Amino acid sequence: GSEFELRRQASNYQLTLTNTRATVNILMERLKKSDADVEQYRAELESVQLAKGALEQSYLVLQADAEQLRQQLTESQDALNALRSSS
Amino acid sequence: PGSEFELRRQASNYQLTLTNTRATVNILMERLKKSDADVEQYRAELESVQLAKGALEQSYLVLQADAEQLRQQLTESQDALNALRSS
Amino acid sequence: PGSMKEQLLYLSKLLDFEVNFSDYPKGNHNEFLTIVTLSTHPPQICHGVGKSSEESQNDAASNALKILSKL
Amino acid sequence: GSMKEQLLYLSKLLDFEVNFSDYPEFLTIVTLSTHPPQICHGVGKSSEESQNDAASNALKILSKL
């Protein structure tokens, strides 16, 4: 008869544990997925930062190509006008 | 009266299991909060860098148009100087 | 209103046990999540899911009330 | 000879399942299909250290039952 009380206590603790473990479960599944999500975004961030670095270098090449063009035009003009003045 | 020793014992083991498990739940809750936050962060960082990369591509194209104008100007200067040399 | 959440709070004020809600936004997950803790004996850690924090809170509260009645 | 190895020896011996779940300190949750089942954790500076801290906490719990 103390055993009705034993089995009742056992019953309520079993309910409590089962319930709680269900909570633990949803926390673990969501935490696993979130972690995967974070690795994916990490990798994507890496690819795009690489691409941006590459483009920054290209901008520097194009900028240099442009100043080279300006100096070449200035000199060419000076030449054309010197030959115009000579003739 | 012996049933009370085993009652209090079972209770003791369930209490232990529950305490342990709740400490785990707490750890899981903090870790899930932090991971979810990280997902937000990397997602936002990703958009920030894609947008920055986009502004950079537009700058590149504008400078490319600049350089294109310069090349045509330089070429016409060259044609002028070389035509004048040939005369 | 009159809600699940209100019934549980009525019950916690009435029976002097503490009840704490913790809400997790949808984020990149399939739904909202709420964990609710009950400082009962034995203590309970229940959860609820929903399409909103309101819904997940009521789902949690409900979970909590079912467990309390089953003890 | 490690904590993890003791627990696995113990689970192979008493026929309960043991599952490690690792989370990037490092965190390990170890689940034990005993009666009543247990869910322990351990932290560390590497996945190995956290796994053995978890196993250790599991062994302590099992001994207190």
Residue numbers in the entry:
A (entry chain A): 503 to 589
B (entry chain C): 502 to 588
C (entry chain F): 948 to 1018
D (entry chain H): 949 to 972, 978 to 1018
Give the article text.
Mira is a multi-domain scaffold protein that concentrates at the basal cortex along with its cargos during mitosis of Drosophila NB asymmetric division. The Stau family of dsRNA-binding proteins exerts a conserved function in mRNA transport, localization and translational control from Drosophila to mammals. However, both dsRBDs 2 and 5 are required for the anchoring of bicoid mRNA, whereas dsRBD5 also directs the actin-dependent localization of pros mRNA through interaction with Mira, pointing to other functional roles of dsRBDs 2 and 5 rather than RNA binding.
The complex structure was solved by single-wavelength anomalous dispersion using Se–Met derivatives at 2.5 Å resolution. The structure revealed that the complex forms a 2:2 heterotetrameric architecture, in which two Stau dsRBD5s interact symmetrically with the N-terminal end of the Mira coiled-coil homodimer. In accord with the previous small-angle X-ray scattering-based structure prediction, two Mira514–595 fragments, each made up of a single contiguous α-helix, dimerize in a parallel manner to form an elongated ‘rod-like' structure. Interestingly, the Mira coiled-coil dimer is slightly asymmetric, with one curved helix A wrapping around the other approximately straight one A′. The interesting feature of the Mira514–595/Stau dsRBD5 complex structure is that Stau dsRBD5 binds to Mira through the exposed face of its β-sheet, a mode that has never been observed in any other dsRBDs before this study. Hydrophobic residues, such as Tyr971Stau on β1, Leu980Stau and Ile982Stau on β2, Ile992Stau and Val996Stau on β3 of dsRBD5, Ile528Mira and Leu529Mira from helix A, and Val526′Mira, Met530′Mira, and Leu533′Mira from helix A′ form the hydrophobic core at the interface. In line with the complex structure, L557EMira mutation was also found to disrupt the Mira–Stau interaction, demonstrating that the dimer assembly of Mira CBD is crucial for Stau dsRBD5 binding.
